[PDB]
Structure formats: structure tokens, C-alpha cells
Design a protein around this ligand. Structure first.
Ligand SMILES: *[C@@H]1O[C@H](CO)[C@@H](O[C@@H]2O[C@H](CO)[C@@H](O[C@@H]3O[C@H](CO)[C@@H](O)[C@H](O)[C@@H]3O)[C@H](O)[C@H]2NC(C)=O)[C@H](O)[C@H]1NC(C)=O
Ligand SMILES: *[C@@H]1O[C@H](CO)[C@@H](O[C@@H]2O[C@H](CO)[C@@H](O[C@@H]3O[C@H](CO)[C@@H](O)[C@H](O)[C@@H]3O)[C@H](O)[C@H]2NC(C)=O)[C@H](O)[C@H]1NC(C)=O
Ligand SMILES: *[C@@H]1O[C@H](CO)[C@@H](O[C@@H]2O[C@H](CO)[C@@H](O[C@@H]3O[C@H](CO)[C@@H](O)[C@H](O)[C@@H]3O)[C@H](O)[C@H]2NC(C)=O)[C@H](O)[C@H]1NC(C)=O
Ligand SMILES: *[C@@H]1O[C@H](CO)[C@@H](O[C@@H]2O[C@H](CO)[C@@H](O[C@H]3O[C@H](CO)[C@@H](O)[C@H](O)[C@@H]3O)[C@H](O)[C@H]2NC(C)=O)[C@H](O)[C@H]1NC(C)=O
Ligand SMILES: *[C@@H]1O[C@H](CO)[C@@H](O[C@@H]2O[C@H](CO)[C@@H](O[C@H]3O[C@H](CO)[C@@H](O)[C@H](O)[C@@H]3O)[C@H](O)[C@H]2NC(C)=O)[C@H](O)[C@H]1NC(C)=O
Ligand SMILES: *[C@@H]1O[C@H](CO[C@H]2O[C@@H](C)[C@@H](O)[C@@H](O)[C@@H]2O)[C@@H](O[C@@H]2O[C@H](CO)[C@@H](O)[C@H](O)[C@H]2NC(C)=O)[C@H](O)[C@H]1NC(C)=O
Ligand SMILES: *[C@@H]1O[C@H](CO)[C@@H](O[C@@H]2O[C@H](CO)[C@@H](O)[C@H](O)[C@H]2NC(C)=O)[C@H](O)[C@H]1NC(C)=O
Ligand SMILES: *[C@@H]1O[C@H](CO)[C@@H](O)[C@H](O)[C@H]1NC(C)=O
Ligand SMILES: *[C@@H]1O[C@H](CO)[C@@H](O)[C@H](O)[C@H]1NC(C)=O
Ligand SMILES: *[C@@H]1O[C@H](CO)[C@@H](O)[C@H](O)[C@H]1NC(C)=O
Ligand SMILES: *[C@@H]1O[C@H](CO)[C@@H](O)[C@H](O)[C@H]1NC(C)=O
Ligand SMILES: *[C@@H]1O[C@H](CO)[C@@H](O)[C@H](O)[C@H]1NC(C)=O
Lengths: 196, 423, 224, 285, 49
């Protein structure tokens, strides 16, 4: 049942056609559903009354089929438009839209053709093994408030480091890691520590 | 021959009526049919008389079974059905006309008779009865007692009677009294004689033009009314208003002349009993879809049944044709209807077969079908603190598949071939 | 536009048309115009209706009855006295006569705050004559008042005759004659769609004339 | 039975109509699942609401109520009012006018309580874990520090947030209060949701009112035709009703299919907004 | 053909409208497609059919 979406489209179209063909076995109030039998049995004047009943039913059957096909076609068009957008934004580029190209941080996608459809193999980055750390918004060093240029301040219990905020890579808090802004009196949660 | 796991809609179930009910006003006096039919003499076509029939019980079977009538045609009702039908008022109109004019009596016709003396409506509902009365009201010398109006300024409206003898003048020149230029006596006598050929012989015609199912019925059939039972799914018949439903006493206020209270869909949802002047609530009996819950057939042949929309007390109290699951002992009343054949449990699992209103069915181990409230997911309390952060120390590369339909089969249909195969 | 008549020597009691119904509200005592005539000849030729709605009961007398040029009792009562007897000229023939419950309108002598708005809707159609009625206790004796009140049906009769005209019946020499202080209205009904508001009790509390003005027509279209 | 046997001469029109409506009903449950069931764990906010000064009390669940709906969620459920009758709080039969004539309303798969739980889990995950719970395991981070990341995401240095944290929290709390006041006062806020309810109710009423039409028959009441006419001439009158009523049902189903497509497009947009606006920070203008 | 997408919308709507109007010329099994002609030639009983 991996390809249920594609199978449903095939089944629905096949089911609709079968229903359309099965409607040729309905009297719709005529003496028989076989047009030749009516002609062979009745003369023109009475045959028209019987034939007209079949025309009304058969014509109504066709209109019902076409209207359903138009509604189904619109649904397929919306799906195709989405697939085209996924091809451009997931395969021809890297997407920052959340969950648009799979679960996790999207890296790349590969297209695979399927009957009446397309399959996308979304490659994502998923962080795996998290650890608790104590954190602070800024470091107070010399009456100055230091903030991470790109990362977050963490402590293993005794020492403070800067790490990129998607993968634990602790580093010494230096003047290149951080930038200064104001003093230590305004930031809530600032912690004393040396900036090397 | 094999059905996949899921829940499937099956023929709807419905509570059949237990018994029939007939409620007519109690009257015993027969209608004066003998007066209208065996009257000594009939009025003329232009002077057609209209005798009212009311407050009586009419046994139309006797009229229809008599072969003396050359024509007995009913246009809005069948003669057989009359015996069981309750009417508001009946107008019995009698007149004598030439045999050839019998056709003109039918509704939607035209002619001097149909345009000067007697005209029926297009939507006529009733029965017309006729029989030759040559021997009864014909004489060798010419029984000129029967006349008809041949001259009239304008066509008469349906069911209109004209008695004025004003002298009409087609070619202007208005005279009066004695005839003359362009002006003649409007009424002309028929040559009703026994020697006259068929068609020219006089015919006695009586027509009933009763109104149907629009007001408190007054005349109705010689069928005995039965007893009144309520709170039961039954077939009811209040003065010809047949139907099915469950009766119940109501706090309704019908005006004295009111008998029926109708619904938005033009259905009577409250009636007044003709015998006892009380208002009863009308409600078609309980119904609903029937859904069969099954795992894969090759997984098991055990199934559960959902009677959606009806609470379970009714089911022990029909259409589905298998009243074998009624044994119960595991009937569960869900917000989506009664579920039979499924064991209810308090354990919550991921939804497997949706039933509705948060209830799902699964086939699990000894094996049986269970019903439970679906679980949304595993409970989890994020260890949030104002100075605590979780940072991933490692990662996994995941590859997930996404399937999207893109196109569907290109189909073309030849309209003429499908509708008219080479015809 | 509803015509106004003086129920009096000055007998404003003509053979008015009965075009598809009439509205006959009025406030007065003694019922003045108690009876009414509905037919097409009204001179004993045809079974012209003779409905009296007198103090006792609404005696339907649809007979081929004679109505003289002035078929009135001429009772100069409280000026109770009688002058002649022509209310019922003669019954040459008849077709049907019905008598209802011995009711009594409030025609009894009482003016005070006139609660005599005996609103009547006399309608004849499809071989029937309907006498929808309502007794509204209004407070002003002057021209017809402002308010809303539905008229309950009173009488329904499968007559079956054809009616094209009508006439009212007055029960009330010429020197120093005090004209009676009584008047009646004759409204006319025409095919019109109305949006009737039924309260929770099955009583019509409001209505909208769907052809009165654009706002009413908008309400009719929205069914609100 | 007489009408039913005649209706068999039209083939499988009835089967198509039931199948079409079943596809719509199933799709409604799918629409809700796509939008709300985007989280596989039911996160719950901690008992201590130390979120750096930010008030979320008006959007977090209220334990007191039998349904764990937030204050604003309660306001939303009061503004929207049904049209015909209970669809719901029904403890018995549906009790609707449509029920008389083979028309039934199916309950949604997810109850309102379940949908509120999903909203609570999505909300608890966002305020305790930022956008991490949408990409994997929920990684807690102080809310003020999370807001610093958001500011960086729009090109504002994080020192701006920290130096204005008290002001920023007040503006957010004030802004949330105005949403509460707006919903409590105004009536046409939820016009989009009301329109869907009205359109479905209106279409359903039209379908039921269509049973009062003669369609050229002597009467619109099927029983009256059977009671007055014999089989031969009754079929002619019965067939006129079948044609009209069958046409009425097809018109209703076609409109529902077109309305369902519009609702599905709306639901797909809501699911995309949930993923891109709630489970992350969006740079789309 | 730069603006074919906009032109198609105009053509489709015009074509559908023309088809709707042209459909008034069809008998549909009646004696004539002209309503006035039917009324002028037949009495109400037959005209209704
Ligand atoms: C938090 O991180 C800091 C830095 O990694 C840790 O402090 C470090 O502790 C280790 C010992 O476990 C020290 O390594 C040692 O290096 C010296 C030379 O400097 C050597 O003589 C010792 O024999 C040993 O090999 C490291 O120097 C020291 N760094 C500092 C700045 O003190 C700390 O252990 C971590 N705290 C926790 C609770 O994990
Ligand atoms: C980061 O900066 C300093 C690091 O020590 C701390 O804030 C300060 O704590 C010191 C105590 O060592 C206080 O300085 C002292 O002031 C008192 C009061 O005048 C005086 O009696 C002492 O002799 C000493 O001079 C100081 O009050 C206190 N606050 C400030 C603004 O300096 C603390 O560890 C950290 N504070 C922040 C905002 O990061
Ligand atoms: C239409 O019918 C309803 C229900 O019958 C009417 O309801 C009215 O409800 C009020 C409630 O206060 C009743 O007043 C009360 O009367 C009862 C009985 O005497 C008394 O026990 C209470 O203490 C209170 O005084 C009122 O009587 C009742 N009306 C009737 C006729 O029963 C409603 O008034 C009717 N009209 C409308 C527009 O709804
Ligand atoms: C980050 O996640 C990685 C898993 O995707 C993990 O790689 C795995 O490391 C273990 C340890 O060596 C490997 O185990 C091999 O070693 C152990 C011990 O001998 C056995 O249990 C295994 O059968 C095999 O012998 C895993 O095979 C290996 N998996 C892969 C794809 O390389 C990393 O260790 C994780 N990195 C950190 C720092 O935690
Ligand atoms: C977060 O915002 C909440 C509402 O915006 C706010 O809740 C409100 O708290 C105050 C003080 O407790 C209440 O004030 C008054 O309400 C009680 C109700 O019994 C009165 O009896 C007292 O006189 C009273 O001081 C608000 O009623 C209350 N509103 C609600 C819906 O709970 C929180 O205080 C805010 N949380 C923080 C940490 O600031
Ligand atoms: C990260 O922290 C929480 C809570 O506990 C840890 O909290 C840190 C702040 C630090 O003090 C550390 O020493 C401490 O162990 C953990 O959640 C807890 O998980 C355990 C599992 O048994 C439960 O017993 C606790 O009830 C549960 N508390 C809460 C609020 O959820 C969490 O497991 C831990 N995560 C990692 C990756 O280490
Ligand atoms: C964050 O939470 C911690 C504790 O949960 C706060 O630390 C102090 O904790 C003690 C507990 O008894 C309180 O008496 C103090 O009042 C807390 N500090 C303040 C200012 O109230 C800490 O303050 C909180 N804020 C930050 C930025 O860490
Ligand atoms: C009328 O007369 C004939 C015999 O003369 C009789 O058979 C018939 O029953 C009579 N009809 C009625 C209603 O009496
Ligand atoms: C039916 O019987 C009851 C009492 O037996 C009676 O009140 C009622 O009038 C009868 N019906 C008619 C039409 O008379
Ligand atoms: C179902 O079970 C039968 C065993 O009786 C097996 O032959 C068949 O392959 C199974 N079909 C599916 C779809 O699993
Ligand atoms: C659920 O738990 C109760 C007791 O807490 C038990 O009695 C009941 O049987 C369980 N529910 C079902 C359907 O068995
Ligand atoms: C089910 O209907 C019955 C009446 O037939 C009623 O007694 C019972 O309370 C109902 N149960 C529920 C759960 O609605």
C-alpha cells in the first residue's frame, strides 16, 4: 500500500468508466435497454417514444460522467501543480519551508517517476542525541555584555562555551565568537564569565 | 469475494410498521346516489343541475359494478380506489346530452357544448358516468323537453350555468324577444326519438367533481375505522391520509377547522384524529445506515456492525435481514450509533478503523474486535526551564518518500456511439 | 385605498362589487350592517346569499330570496321603534340555509373605549364563502387604527355557486331625520404574496407585503 | 415499493450519489488530520510559566472547563452558531428536519476535545521548544532566548530583544489582549467559518424543500398518488417525481463536490500554514 | 500568442455563452423550438406537453 495515492486515481477512473458502460443496460423506463431490439420490434412512431427514454437516460449518464471527470481533473491538476512546485523547490534547490520537502531540515530531494505520478526521495537532517546544558543569553565580562555572533552560550556545569545551535561543538568564548552591546545591567539572565 | 480491512456502508436499516391504523369519521347513512342516478327526469345540458353530496358514506363499488353504464371514466382517481378514499365535498351534476357529445364532456375538449353550456376544467379530478336513456326519455314524436344553448356572446367559464334566454346576435343588429335578422333563440331542442340512430339518442350523464385531500374530509368510504395506538411504529390513515410513523400525543393547537399540520417538505408531521378531536404527533420511524466493520477477510471472517444514528435501545426493540447479532452481550452505544460485535476497552490505541466521535475499532488478541477511544499520541512534558537548553550532539540522515499523482488516463468518448450505437 | 361608507334616509348601502374578497372591519353598536348579500342577481333570480350575522347567530340563508330596492327594517331606534318590514322581502325559492352557534357580537350598547373592531374578511372563491374574523379591543373611535392582529377563520361552506357582486344589509320619516352614527369600510383583496411570521405558538405576529416597497421585497427575497 | 422498483430502471445513479457523498465525508476527516495531527507527541507546558514575561494564559488550555479549551478557543466556539439544528451536543437522535427524508449527518472522527488537545500540543511545543519539535525531538530553550533567534531570523540583532525584553513582552501581552477584546465584541470576525455552515445548511434545506414540487405530477406526495391511482396510470405520475427528485439529488451532490474541493484547498493551505508558520519561522512575505 | 492564457479565459467564457444561447434553437422533441409558435398553434392542453 505504499503507492495507494496512485492506485486510487487508477481505480477511480476505472470505476467511473465501468459505471458509464453499465448504464447501457438500463431501461430508463423503455421496453428494453437494447436499441436494436426496440427497432426490430416497433415501428417508427412507437419506437421513438421508447428510443427517447433511452436517449434521456444515456445522455444523463454521460453528463454525470463528464462532470465527475472535470472535478477529478481539477483535483489532479492541483496535485500536479504541487508536484511541479516540489520539483523546483526541493530538487532544483534547498527549501527552508518547514515540512515542504520532508520532515526535518531539508538537504536535497531526488525525483523518481511512477505510473501517472512522481515520487520524491527527500533527504533531511535530523538531530539525534541531545544533552541538557545550562545556558545564558549573554556573558558579563568587564562591565560589558557579550552576545554570540552565531551560536548559543552553554555550560557543562563549570565552564562556559559557545556552540553552534544545531550540533554540540563547544568553543572558548573569545572576542571573535561574540560581540559587545551595552553593559550588564539590562540583560535578564546575564552571567559573569571571562571572554578571552 | 475478499474485502480489505475497513468499515463499509451497507444497505440502510429501518423500523417497519407494526400494524395498520384507519381513522375515519363515524357515519352510517349512505349518500343519495339513488336520488341522482334513479331520478325520474334529468335536467337539460344548459340547465344542468348540481346536487351536493356530503355528510355520508359512499360505496362507489356498487356504481362501478353496474353494467348499465356505457361510460365510467375517472380522470384523477381510479374507481376501485374510491372505496378507500376520504373526500372533502362532492358535486354530482346531472344532464342529458346527445350521444355524440359524450366525448366533449371529457376535460380539455372543445365545441358548442364545451363552449356554451357545460365546460370541464383542464385539471378535472373525478368520475364521469353515462348511460343511454332512449327508452326512458324519448318519444316517437320528439321529446323536445331537452334543449341546449347554441348561441352565446362569449364562451362560458368551466362549471358555469346559463339560463338567460337573451336573443344573441352574431351579425350585430341587436334584436330581442321575437327572432329575426342575425338573432335567434339561443336554446335549441334535440330530436330525441327512438327511431333516431345511435349517437343521436339521448344519454343520461352524471359526473362527480369531488375535491381531494385539502380540507377536513366529510364524505368517505364504507371501511370500518380501527383502534388508535400510539408510541409504536405503525401505518396510519387519517381520512385517506395514509403514511408510516410513530404517533404521540402533542401540545398542538389546531384551529377548529384544521385537520392536518404539514412539514417543510410538505409532509404531515401532526394530525387530528377524526373520531376524537385530539392532535397527534407524527414521526417516520427510526432509520439509519448500516456499516460493517471488518479486518481483512484473509485475516479473519469476524465482523462488527454499526447501526449509525440510532441509539442501541431501539435495536433490541427490520431491513438488515440478519437479526442474529441481537443476542448482544457486547453491544456498545457510541456517539456514532450502536456498535454490535465489538468489545469495548478502556485502553487507548492508535486509530485503526475509524468509527466516529473519537471511537476506533481494531482486531487484536483469543482474537476479537475491540472498540476504544483513539489515542492522539504519547504524552510528553518538555523539560522547559528559563536557563536550560538541549543541544543535539549527533545526527541522522533520513530519506523519506513522497508520492504525488500527476496525470490520469486520457479518455475520449464518442457521444453518438455511446448513446446511439450505429442507429 | 379602502372606501369608507356611511351606514345611515342616506342609505349608503349599494350593491358593491365583491372582487375576489372584501375587508369589512368596523366599530359600532347594534351591528347596523348585521347582514350582507353575495351573488350575481341579488333580486331573488339566483340563490343570492343572505347572511345576517345577527345578535343571535350567523344564519346563512343562501336562498333565491327577494331584496327590495330598500330591504331594511327602517328602525329609528333610540331616536327602539320600527317603520316597516322589508329586511326579508320574500323567499321565492331557496338553495341552502345554515344556522351557527347562538353567539353574540359586542354590538350591545357600549362606546367607552371602543373594543368593537370586529374585523371581518369576507372572501368567496372556489365555491366557498369564508368569514375570517377577529375581535380587536382598540381604543380610538376615529378612522381605522394602527396595529397587527391575525383574523381566525370562522365559517367555511361548500356552496359551489358563482358570485360576481355583493350587497350589505341595513336594518335602519325624512323630515328632521337624525342620520345614524355608523360607518363601515370595504377593502379589496388582490393576489399578493405575504411573508407571515409565525411565533413559537402558531400565531401570526408579523407580515410583510412583498410588493409594498423595495425594502419589503428584499425581506421577501431573503425570507427574513 | 412501487416507486423503488421504478427507480431500479435508472441503473446505478443512486450508488454513484452515495459513493460521491461518502468520498466527501471521508475527506473531511482527512482535512482535519492534515491540519492538526502534525505532532506525534502530546507536549504539555510546564507548571511554572516563566516565559520571560510573556503571557500565554489566554491561549493555553484552561483545566477548569470540561473541555480543555483555551480562553480564546471558547470565544471562537461561541461566535459560530449552527443554522438548522444540532449536528455536536446531541445526546439522542440527530433531531433535524432533513432526517425525515433519508438525510443524515455523520459525526467527525476527531471530537472537539481531541482537536483542542492537538492545538494544545502544538502550542506547548512551540513555546517550550521553538521550531525544534517540528524537525525532530523537542529541544527545550528559554523563551526569551528563542525570541532572540526569531529576531535574528528577521535581520535584527539579538541584543535588541534582550535590551527591550520587558517592552517586547508587554507589547505581546497587550496585543493578545486586543485579540480577546475583538472576538468578545465583534460578530463578523468568523464570517469565513459561518459562510461554510450557512452554505451547507442552505443547500440541505433546498434539497428537502425540493420534495414539495410536483414536477408536473398530480401531487408531490407519493402516498397520495398511490392511494388515488391504479398501477398503470400511477407509474406515469410516479415517474415524474422520480425524474425531478433524482435531478434534485444530483444537483445537490455536484454542488457538494465543488464545495468540498474549495474546502480541501482551504484545508491544504491551513496545513501549510501550520507547518510553515507554527512549526517554523517563515520568510515568505 | 504571448497572452494566450488570458485569451483562453475570454474565449472559453464566450464559447460557453454562445452555446447556451444557441441551445434555445433546439426542439428537444417539441414541435418547434419557438415558444410563441407553440402557444399560437395549440390549445393549453396540448401546448403544455
Ligand atoms: C567543562 O569543560 C572544561 C574544558 O573542557 C573542562 O575543564 C577541563 O577539565 C580537564 C580535566 O578533565 C582538563 O584537562 C587537563 O588538562 C591539563 C592541562 O591544562 C592537564 O594537566 C590535566 O592532566 C588534564 O589532562 C582541562 O585542562 C580543563 N580545562 C580548564 C579551562 O579548566 C571541565 O572538566 C568541564 N567540566 C565538566 C563538569 O564536565
Ligand atoms: C556580574 O558582575 C559582578 C561580578 O562580581 C556581579 O555583580 C556585582 O557583584 C559584586 C560583588 O562582587 C558587587 O560589587 C560590590 O558592590 C557592593 C555594593 O556596593 C560592595 O559593597 C562590594 O564591596 C563590591 O564592590 C556588585 O554590587 C554587583 N553588581 C554590579 C552591577 O556590579 C555579578 O556576579 C554579576 N552581575 C551581572 C548583572 O551580571
Ligand atoms: C406561547 O406559549 C408559551 C408556552 O406555553 C407561552 O409561555 C409563557 O411563559 C411564561 C413564563 O413566565 C408564563 O408566565 C408564567 O405563567 C405560569 C403559569 O401561570 C406561572 O406559573 C409562572 O410563574 C409565570 O407567571 C406564561 O403563562 C406562559 N404563557 C402561556 C399562555 O402559557 C407564551 O407566553 C406564549 N406566547 C409567546 C409569544 O411565546
Ligand atoms: C551518531 O550516530 C551514529 C549512528 O548512525 C553512530 O554511528 C555508530 O557508532 C557505533 C559505535 O561504533 C557503531 O557500532 C559499530 O560499533 C558498535 C560497537 O562495536 C556495534 O554495536 C555495531 O554493531 C558496530 O560494531 C555503529 O555501527 C555506527 N553506525 C554507523 C552508520 O556508523 C555514531 O556513533 C554517533 N556518533 C556519536 C559521537 O555519538
Ligand atoms: C497573564 O494574563 C492573565 C490574564 O491576562 C492574568 O490573569 C489575571 O490575573 C489577575 C490577578 O490575579 C486577575 O485579577 C482579578 O481577578 C480575580 C478573579 O477572581 C479577582 O477576584 C481579583 O480581584 C483579581 O486581582 C485576573 O482576573 C486574571 N484573569 C484571568 C482570566 O485569569 C495573569 O495574572 C497573567 N499572569 C502573570 C504571571 O502575570
Ligand atoms: C534533561 O533534563 C530533564 C530533567 O532532568 C535533568 O535536568 C537537568 C536540568 C539537569 O539538572 C540534569 O542533571 C537532570 O538529570 C530530563 O527530563 C527528566 O527525564 C527523567 C528520566 O527518568 C525523569 O525522571 C524526569 O521526571 C524528567 N523530568 C522532566 C521535567 O521531564 C531529561 O531526561 C534530560 N534530557 C537529556 C537529553 O539528558
Ligand atoms: C529563572 O528561574 C530561577 C529559579 O527557577 C530564578 O532564580 C531565582 O530562584 C529563587 C528561588 O527561590 C528566587 O527566590 C529568585 O527570586 C529567583 N530570581 C528572581 C529574579 O526572581 C531566576 O531569577 C529566573 N530568571 C532567570 C533569568 O534565570
Ligand atoms: C338505478 O336503477 C337500476 C334499475 O332500475 C338499478 O340497477 C340501480 O341500482 C339504480 N341505481 C341506484 C344508485 O339506486
Ligand atoms: C365519531 O364518534 C364520536 C363519539 O363516538 C363522536 O363524537 C363523533 O361525532 C363521531 N364522528 C362524527 C363525524 O360524527
Ligand atoms: C491473505 O491470506 C491468504 C492465506 O489464506 C493468502 O493466500 C493471501 O496471499 C493473503 N492476501 C493478502 C493481500 O495479504
Ligand atoms: C474500564 O475500567 C472500569 C473500572 O475502572 C471497568 O469496570 C470497565 O469494565 C472497563 N471498561 C470496559 C469496557 O470493560
Ligand atoms: C436511548 O433511547 C431510549 C428510549 O428508547 C432511552 O430510554 C435511552 O435513555 C436512550 N439512551 C441514550 C444514551 O440516549
Amino acid at each position: 500500500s505504499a503507492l495507494g495515492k496512485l492506485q486510487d486515481v487508477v481505480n477511480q477512473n476505472a470505476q467511473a468508466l465501468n459505471t458509464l458502460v453499465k448504464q447501457l443496460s438500463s431501461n430508463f423506463g423503455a421496453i428494453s435497454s437494447v436499441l436494436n431490439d426496440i427497432l426490430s420490434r416497433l415501428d417508427p412512431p412507437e419506437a421513438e417514444v421508447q428510443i427517447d427514454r433511452l436517449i434521456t437516460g444515456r445522455l444523463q449518464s454521460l453528463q454525470t460522467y463528464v462532470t465527475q471527470q472535470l472535478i477529478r481533473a481539477a483535483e489532479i491538476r492541483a496535485s500536479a501543480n504541487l508536484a511541479a512546485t516540489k520539483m523546483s523547490e526541493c530538487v532544483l534547490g534547498q527549501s527552508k519551508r518547514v515540512d515542504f520537502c520532508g520532515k526535518g531540515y531539508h538537504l536535497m530531494s531526488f525525483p523518481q517517476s511512477a505510473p501517472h505520478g512522481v515520487v520524491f526521495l527527500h533527504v533531511t537532517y535530523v538531530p539525534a542525541q541531545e544533552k541538557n546544558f545550562t545556558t545564558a543569553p549573554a556573558i558579563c565580562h568587564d562591565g560589558k555584555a557579550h552576545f554570540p555572533r552565531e551560536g548559543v552560550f552553554v555550560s557543562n556545569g563549570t565552564h562556559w562555551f559557545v556552540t553552534q545551535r544545531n550540533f554540540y561543538e563547544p568553543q572558548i568564548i573569545t572576542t571573535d565568537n561574540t560581540f559587545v552591546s551595552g553593559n550588564c545591567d539590562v540583560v535578564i539572565g546575564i552571567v559573569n564569565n571571562t571572554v578571552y | 469475494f475478499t474485502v480489505e480491512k475497513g468499515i463499509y456502508q451497507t444497505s440502510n436499516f429501518r423500523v417497519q410498521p407494526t400494524e395498520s391504523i384507519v381513522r375515519f369519521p363515524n357515519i352510517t347513512n349512505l349518500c343519495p346516489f339513488g336520488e341522482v342516478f334513479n331520478a325520474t327526469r334529468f335536467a337539460s345540458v344548459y340547465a344542468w343541475n348540481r346536487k351536493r353530496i356530503s355528510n355520508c358514506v359512499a360505496d362507489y363499488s356498487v356504481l362501478y359494478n353496474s353494467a348499465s353504464f356505457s361510460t365510467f371514466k375517472c380522470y384523477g382517481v381510479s374507481p376501485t380506489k374510491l372505496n378507500d378514499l376520504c373526500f372533502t365535498n362532492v358535486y354530482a351534476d346531472s344532464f342529458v346530452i346527445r350521444g355524440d357529445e359524450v366525448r366533449q364532456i371529457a376535460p380539455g375538449q372543445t365545441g358548442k357544448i364545451a363552449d356554451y353550456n357545460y365546460k370541464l376544467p383542464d385539471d378535472f379530478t373525478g368520475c364521469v358516468i353515462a348511460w343511454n336513456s332512449n327508452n326512458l326519455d324519448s318519444k316517437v314524436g320528439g321529446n323536445y323537453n331537452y334543449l341546449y344553448r347554441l348561441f352565446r356572446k362569449s364562451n362560458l367559464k368551466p362549471f358555469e350555468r346559463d339560463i338567460s334566454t337573451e336573443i344573441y346576435q352574431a351579425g350585430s343588429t341587436p334584436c330581442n324577444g321575437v327572432e329575426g335578422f342575425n338573432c335567434y333563440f339561443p336554446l335549441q331542442s334535440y330530436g330525441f326519438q327512438p327511431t333516431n340512430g345511435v349517437g343521436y339518442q339521448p344519454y343520461r350523464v352524471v359526473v362527480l367533481s369531488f375535491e381531494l385531500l385539502h380540507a377536513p374530509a366529510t364524505v368517505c368510504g364504507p371501511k370500518k375505522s380501527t383502534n388508535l395506538v400510539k408510541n409504536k411504529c405503525v401505518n396510519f390513515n387519517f381520512n385517506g391520509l395514509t403514511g408510516t410513523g410513530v404517533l404521540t400525543e402533542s401540545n398542538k393547537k389546531f384551529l377548529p377547522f384544521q385537520q392536518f399540520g404539514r412539514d417543510i417538505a410538505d409532509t404531515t408531521d401532526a394530525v387530528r384524529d377524526p373520531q376524537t378531536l385530539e392532535i397527534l404527533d407524527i414521526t417516520p420511524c427510526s432509520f439509519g445506515g448500516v456499516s460493517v466493520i471488518t479486518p481483512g477477510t484473509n485475516t479473519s471472517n469476524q465482523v462488527a456492525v454499526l447501526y449509525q444514528g440510532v441509539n442501541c435501545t431501539e435495536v433490541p426493540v427490520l431491513t438488515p435481514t440478519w437479526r442474529v447479532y441481537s443476542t448482544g452481550s457486547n453491544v456498545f452505544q457510541t456517539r456514532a450509533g450502536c456498535l454490535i460485535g465489538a468489545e469495548h476497552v478502556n485502553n487507548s490505541y492508535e486509530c485503526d478503523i475509524p468509527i466516529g466521535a473519537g471511537i476506533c475499532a481494531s482486531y487484536q488478541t483469543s482474537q476479537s474486535i475491540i472498540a476504544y477511544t483513539m489515542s492522539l499520541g504519547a504524552e510528553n512534558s518538555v523539560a522547559y526551564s528559563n536557563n536550560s537548553i538541549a543541544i543535539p550532539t549527533n545526527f541522522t540522515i533520513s530519506v523519506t518518500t513522497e508520492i504525488l499523482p500527476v496525470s490520469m488516463t486520457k479518455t475520449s468518448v464518442d457521444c453518438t456511439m455511446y448513446i446511439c450505437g450505429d442507429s | 385605498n379602502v372606501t369608507w361608507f356611511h351606514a345611515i334616509k342616506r342609505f349608503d348601502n349599494p350593491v358593491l362589487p365583491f372582487n375576489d374578497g372584501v375587508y369589512f372591519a368596523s366599530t359600532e353598536k347594534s351591528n347596523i350592517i348585521r347582514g350582507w348579500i353575495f351573488g350575481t342577481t341579488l333580486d331573488s333570480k339566483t340563490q343570492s346569499l343572505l347572511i345576517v350575522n345577527n345578535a343571535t347567530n350567523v344564519v346563512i340563508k343562501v336562498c333565491e330570496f327577494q331584496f327590495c330596492n330598500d330591504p331594511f327594517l327602517g328602525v329609528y331606534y333610540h331616536k327602539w321603534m320600527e317603520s316597516e318590514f322589508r329586511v326579508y322581502s320574500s323567499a321565492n325559492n331557496c338553495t341552502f340555509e345554515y344556522v351557527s352557534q347562538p353567539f353574540l357580537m359586542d354590538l350591545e350598547g357600549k362606546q367607552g373605549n371602543f373594543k368593537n373592531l370586529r374585523e371581518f374578511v369576507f372572501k368567496n372563491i372556489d365555491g366557498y364563502f369564508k368569514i375570517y374574523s377577529k375581535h380587536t379591543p382598540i381604543n380610538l373611535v376615529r378612522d381605522l387604527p394602527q396595529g397587527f392582529s391575525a383574523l381566525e377563520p370562522l365559517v367555511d361552506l361548500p356552496i359551489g355557486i358563482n358570485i360576481t357582486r355583493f350587497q350589505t344589509l341595513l336594518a335602519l320619516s325624512s323630515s328632521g331625520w337624525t342620520a345614524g352614527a355608523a360607518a363601515y369600510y370595504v377593502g379589496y383583496l388582490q393576489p399578493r404574496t405575504f411573508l407571515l411570521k409565525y411565533n413559537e405558538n402558531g400565531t401570526i405576529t408579523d407580515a410583510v407585503d412583498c410588493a409594498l416597497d423595495p425594502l419589503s421585497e428584499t425581506k421577501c427575497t431573503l425570507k427574513s | 415499493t412501487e416507486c423503488s422498483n421504478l427507480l431500479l430502471q435508472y441503473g446505478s445513479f443512486c450508488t454513484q450519489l452515495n459513493r460521491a457523498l461518502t468520498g466527501i465525508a471521508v475527506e473531511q476527516d482527512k482535512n482535519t488530520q492534515e491540519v492538526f495531527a502534525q505532532v506525534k507527541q502530546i507536549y504539555k507546558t510546564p507548571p511554572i510559566k516563566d516565559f520571560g514575561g510573556f503571557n500565554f494564559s489566554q491561549i493555553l488550555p484552561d483545566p477548569s472547563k470540561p473541555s480543555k479549551r483555551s480562553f480564546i478557543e471558547d470565544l471562537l466556539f461561541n461566535k459560530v452558531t449552527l443554522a438548522d439544528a444540532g449536528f455536536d451536543i446531541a445526546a439522542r437522535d440527530l433531531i433535524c428536519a432533513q432526517k425525515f427524508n433519508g438525510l443524515t449527518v455523520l459525526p467527525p472522527l476527531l471530537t472537539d476535545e481531541m482537536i483542542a488537545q492537538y492545538t494544545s500540543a502544538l502550542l506547548a511545543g512551540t513555546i517550550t521548544s521553538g521550531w525544534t519539535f517540528g524537525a525532530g525531538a523537542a529541544l527545550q530553550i528559554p523563551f526569551a532566548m528563542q525570541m532572540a533567534y526569531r529576531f535574528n531570523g528577521i535581520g535584527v540583532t539579538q541584543n535588541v530583544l534582550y535590551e527591550n525584553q520587558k517592552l517586547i513582552a508587554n507589547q505581546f501581552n497587550s496585543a493578545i489582549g486586543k485579540i480577546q477584546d475583538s472576538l468578545s465584541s465583534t460578530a463578523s470576525a468568523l464570517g469565513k467559518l459561518q459562510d461554510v455552515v450557512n452554505q451547507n445548511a442552505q443547500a440541505l434545506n433546498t434539497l428537502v424543500k425540493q420534495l414539495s414540487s410536483n414536477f408536473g405530477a398530480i401531487s408531490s406526495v407519493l402516498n397520495d398518488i398511490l392511494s388515488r391511482l391504479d398501477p398503470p396510470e400511477a407509474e406515469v405520475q410516479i415517474d415524474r417525481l422520480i425524474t425531478g427528485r433524482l435531478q434534485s439529488l444530483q444537483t445537490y451532490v455536484t454542488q457538494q463536490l465543488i464545495r468540498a474541493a474549495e474546502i480541501r484547498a482551504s484545508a491544504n493551505l491551513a496545513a501549510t500554514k501550520m507547518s510553515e508558520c507554527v512549526l517554523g519561522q517563515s520568510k515568505r512575505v
